[PDB]
Write a protein that binds this ligand. Structure first.
Ligand SMILES: [Br-]
Ligand SMILES: [Br-]
Ligand SMILES: [Br-]
Ligand SMILES: [Br-]
Ligand SMILES: [Br-]
Ligand SMILES: [Br-]
Ligand SMILES: [Br-]
Ligand SMILES: [Br-]
Ligand SMILES: [Br-]
Ligand SMILES: [Br-]
Ligand SMILES: [Br-]
Ligand SMILES: [Br-]
Ligand SMILES: [Br-]
Ligand SMILES: [Br-]
Ligand SMILES: [Br-]
Ligand SMILES: [Br-]
Ligand SMILES: [Br-]
Ligand SMILES: [Br-]
Ligand SMILES: [Br-]
Ligand SMILES: [Br-]
Ligand SMILES: [Br-]
Ligand SMILES: [Br-]
Ligand SMILES: [Br-]
Ligand SMILES: [Ca+2]
Ligand SMILES: [Ca+2]
Ligand SMILES: [Ca+2]
Ligand SMILES: [Ca+2]
Ligand SMILES: [Ca+2]
Ligand SMILES: [Ca+2]
Lengths: 509, 511
């Protein structure tokens, strides 16, 4: 079927050369010399695109466009006109024109416009697929040369870039090559963490910023500027690719000043990593210095009940002079309440908000059929996250902060990974106990938890952390475990997805 | 701050007129005569936009664009070139060029391109705001004059048009004016239905197409064309504005041929409206002719178990000779199974698929908190619907149908409305009730004490139906305050509103 063009111009007779040109290229052109007759044709037929002149004796192009868009708002409209006035450009852009071509127009300019507005999705698919075909071997060589935490950050950024570009391609071979590069990257990263993690605790060790350093190394310098009040947001369980998915939404309100990828401590779980952010201490030092607040895995109830108390203690230890408030948002109603009353906080130096909803979406993928239909794969997960963020009380809180001239600091405690591969053992990405059987190739084994700043019941206590996209399955119910936990979002172990996470500073626009 | 343009061309000397033109207009132009140096400038400085020539002795425009997009993918890239190289327009479009201007270029064509790529958001917001300021009074006058079901369809289309444009706007005053017009429209529509609905059942009545007419009046003509096999999709509970939210997604696969608004029967609920689609009979006639299949509200278990049987019987009654199959998808796994095995249906004349949306009314507090975070208001609801459609097995089924050359028919049984105002009932979270001893606020509901007159069943002559008007929800007196706090701002159906009742029927040809 030929592409059907409706061309409205009072001088459509003088445009015969253009018409013959497009008919040679397999376009069907229907001509009209006035807006009113063009509207009648547009109502009766299903054109693929309309060309409009601006200056016509009866209805103008923009008047014709208004009527046509009201009737069928999905059909692309191009203005083709002698008018060079900026006010007409702005009126046409503001009316959602697809393109605006100034006469005299090269017939190939029109052809470009037809291809760009009707065939761009297929052309982007074809071009992206061939770009990755020509790039993927270079990405395998770059992966092979990684030999520092900074190279790991750079390589992760490269994989995220290609993951987002390839998400809608059709070529399964190329899709599986990207999936094989992600598996190899996580396998190498797993080995890197296993070999370096304990050494990173040595005096004057060369190490990335981690959970227990985050507040002192990256938040306090922004506080000491005393330039604007700071809204410090921890979005629980946010992956780097989720941050990338709503980067352009945020930029409507906030201009990115600084981006520091940083490393979650082990295990990559709220009770350890998120408490470490707020305390500025490793879990073992939280147990030693704050026994009234620190809870081990075995103890009852909430594991992050005391973040305000950890934070106030850390602020005092650092000798800061600030007015500071902490909020934990656990549902829509709480978020909406804080958004509507945020102005109360205008005289704070620091407002800290923990927002738990993504964590809720991440285990809702397995448990609620609603979220399961909405988040079947990583593309669907980022899509649902973006829809969430754009319509969330959290973005209303951020817009309120913007109007009050707050600096925005946005971060997370850890990410999550879509687990594929069972690993037998006697949380599905770390386990702690005094008797444990495991596949040693699959896990990072820590026989002496105190050497990596974790608590131990006794000298027999071990930690086990899953690597790659492994999930720790009990032998007891192995087949049912595999069937239930396959393709779910888990955290606690080692992967780029769980461990390398954004720290972002923005100025209000 | 001036807009910062990076212009990469090996003959930036020949472009001086363009640069002076743009500098007069408050643009700051930084020139570079080769890709390598341009990349270094792009890394060090913060450009708003980049202009690239394709044909250069070193790195090409497209090679330069690849390096720059990798570093800062948000910055628009415009190609300004003359080339004789084959397929360069296609290669540049596929590389996500923002625009492609063929030399020699009118300097005003470049200026257009700058405004379109950097100012379009702000200009659409300003124009939408000013146009609605000029339009809203006209919409109030039109609402005042509505006096036919056809006028109601036209007014609804106008409100939908403006609702979609205004959703991303700053001006609270204009947002509240639109919200007040929607409230008034539903109030008047409620009175209109209350006055006219019973007359629509008279012999030879003037009435819109309804649930029980849909298959015979709108689907059979497409079947009798005997042109292509038909995929007939009923999306459960779909609003007009939800169809609008994914219209441009489905156009990648299917070209819209015909769009007919039609009217759900009362109640606007699956058990009545959706069974009527498949049976071609009103619920009362389903009870009379198919007592083995029809279930009343009082009976246990599924209310839509027999749609395949109702449809096969209707097809036989109409004397159609077709190979036809029915599928009801109630979860991800079912949808994925049908998408992955759709080619098995290649020899069918008709494939009917019921595709359930997400449950908007969970009895579990934790699940309702998730739905409210994702769909607190109409904009959030359309956003979630678009994310759903783009990532659903339903779109995979539609793409499979397209590759087999199926015609697509897309419709729904009824919409849903965001409920705001409690209305007490005595004697299910839907906007209708049926009972023999109902207490209700009569001002809030359309009351039908003779259900058989509107093709509904009655247990006995004490049986009544009540249908909520406006944005009312029917609240139980038992635990009233907790009920109100839970169901406030939820998407419900069963009653009278433009959202529940006036719904799309769409016919598409495969691309
Ligand atoms: Br029309
Ligand atoms: Br004129
Ligand atoms: Br005219
Ligand atoms: Br021309
Ligand atoms: Br590799
Ligand atoms: Br591994
Ligand atoms: Br550090
Ligand atoms: Br907690
Ligand atoms: Br301070
Ligand atoms: Br609050
Ligand atoms: Br809010
Ligand atoms: Br070069
Ligand atoms: Br890109
Ligand atoms: Br030129
Ligand atoms: Br007027
Ligand atoms: Br009004
Ligand atoms: Br009819
Ligand atoms: Br059912
Ligand atoms: Br037939
Ligand atoms: Br809530
Ligand atoms: Br009766
Ligand atoms: Br009654
Ligand atoms: Br009650
Ligand atoms: Ca003219
Ligand atoms: Ca967490
Ligand atoms: Ca050149
Ligand atoms: Ca080329
Ligand atoms: Ca329904
Ligand atoms: Ca009665």
């Amino acid at each position: 079927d030929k592409i059907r063009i409706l061309w409205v111009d009072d001088e459509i007779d003088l445009l015969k050369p253009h018409i013959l040109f497009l008919e040679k290229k397999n376009y069907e052109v229907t001509t009209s010399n006035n807006g009113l007759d063009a509207i009648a044709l547009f109502e009766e037929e299903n054109f693929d695109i309309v060309f409009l002149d601006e200056n016509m004796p009866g209805m103008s192009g923009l008047e014709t466009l208004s009527e046509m868009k009201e009737k069928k708002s999905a059909i692309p409209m191009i203005m083709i006109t002698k008018s060079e006035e900026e006010y007409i450009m702005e009126e046409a852009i503001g009316s959602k024109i697809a393109d605006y071509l100034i006469k005299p127009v090269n017939p190939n300019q029109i052809l470009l416009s037809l291809k760009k507005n009707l065939d761009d999705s297929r052309l982007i698919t074809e071009k992206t697929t061939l770009d990755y075909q020509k790039e993927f071997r270079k990405i395998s060589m770059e992966l092979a040369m990684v030999n520092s935490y900074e190279d790991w950050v750079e390589l992760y950024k490269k994989l995220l870039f290609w993951e987002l570009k390839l998400e809608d391609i059709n070529d399964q071979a190329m899709i599986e090559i990207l999936e094989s590069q992600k598996v190899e990257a996580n396998s190498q990263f797993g080995k890197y963490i296993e070999r370096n993690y304990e050494d990173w605790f040595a005096p004057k060790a060369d190490k990335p910023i981690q959970s227990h350093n985050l507040f002192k190394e990256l938040v306090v310098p922004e506080i000491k500027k005393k330039d604007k009040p700071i809204l410090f947001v921890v979005i629980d369980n946010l992956r780097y690719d989720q941050w990338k998915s709503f980067e352009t939404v945020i930029s409507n309100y906030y201009k990115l000043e600084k981006e520091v990828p940083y490393f979650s401590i082990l295990p990559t779980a709220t009770q350890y990593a998120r408490n470490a952010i707020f305390s500025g201490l490793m879990p073992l030092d939280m147990e030693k210095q704050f026994p009234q607040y620190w809870k081990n895995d075995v103890e009852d109830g909430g594991k992050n009940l005391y973040e305000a108390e950890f934070l106030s203690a850390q602020i005092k230890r650092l000798g800061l002079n600030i007015k500071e408030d902490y909020f934990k948002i656990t549902n829509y109603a709480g978020g909406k309440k804080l958004a509507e009353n945020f102005k109360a906080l205008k005289g704070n130096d620091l407002v800290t908000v923990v927002y738990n909803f993504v964590d809720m979406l991440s285990h809702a993928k397995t448990e609620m059929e609603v979220v399961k239909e909405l988040a079947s794969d990583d593309k669907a997960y980022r899509s649902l996250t973006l829809s969430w963020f754009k319509n969330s009380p959290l973005l209303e809180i951020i817009q309120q902060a913007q109007l009050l001239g707050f600096k925005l600091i946005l971060t997370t405690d850890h990410g999550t990974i879509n687990v594929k591969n069972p690993s037998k053992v006697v949380n599905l990405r770390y386990k702690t106990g005094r008797s444990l059987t495991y596949e040693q190739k699959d896990v990072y084994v820590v026989k002496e938890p105190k050497t990596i700043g974790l608590p131990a019941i006794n000298m027999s206590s071990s930690f086990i952390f899953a690597k790659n996209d492994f999930f720790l399955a009990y032998v007891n119910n192995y087949n049912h475990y595999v069937s239930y936990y396959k393709n779910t979002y888990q955290h606690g172990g080692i992967s780029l997805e769980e461990m390398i996470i954004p720290f972002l500073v923005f100025n209000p626009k």
